[PDB]
């Protein structure tokens, strides 16, 4: 009933490339959708230039997306070779505007944004989301907040009882 993504799942997507940028501790799910949007234009424009580079001779790449409470790693839809692997905690934000999924993790103030394309972009972001919390909640229960279940039957009775 939750074990689903602790093991993980895999979605077929399309990697377009990446783009590195600068962030500062704690921005905003509002200011992030911005940077995220400029991280997509970066690579879209980088792709048009990519295409053209092919005239002097398609340009994207097929990948699988492994999603879990542990990590989120991209692999070769063909060679099945890892192309990148980020432990979930190092991933801070993802978004699914249109069939374009973008996620950004800490490149180990210097973030790196990966840009993929998937007719399931929708479904895809949602999952990462659950992982985020499922992972989060675990990355919460282990800290003695065993009352993680309780802490929500608390973050509520700590809000109405706050009137």
């Amino acid at each position: 009933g939750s074990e689903d993504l602790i093991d993980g799942i895999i979605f077929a997507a399309n990697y377009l490339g990446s783009t590195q940028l600068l962030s500062e501790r704690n921005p905003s799910k509002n200011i992030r959708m911005m940077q995220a949007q400029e991280a997509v234009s970066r690579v879209k424009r980088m792709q048009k230039a990519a295409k053209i580079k092919k005239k002097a001779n398609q340009t994207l790449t097929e990948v699988d997306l492994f999603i879990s409470t542990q990590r989120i790693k991209v692999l070769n839809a063909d060679t099945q070779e890892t192309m990148m692997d980020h432990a979930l905690r190092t991933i801070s934000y993802i978004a699914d505007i249109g069939n374009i999924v973008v996620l950004m993790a800490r490149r180990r103030y210097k973030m790196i944004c990966h840009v993929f394309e998937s007719e399931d972009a929708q479904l895809i972001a949602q999952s990462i989301g659950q992982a985020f919390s499922v992972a989060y909640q675990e990355f919460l229960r282990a800290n003695g907040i065993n009352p993680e279940d309780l802490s929500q039957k608390e973050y509520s009775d700590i809000i109405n009882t706050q009137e």
Binding site: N26, R89, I91, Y93
Partner: peptide
């Protein structure tokens, strides 16, 4: 136009 943040990241991390 939906984006989610990692409670876990925006935690120990930042």
């Amino acid at each position: 136009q939906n984006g989610y943040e990692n409670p876990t990241y925006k935690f120990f991390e930042q």
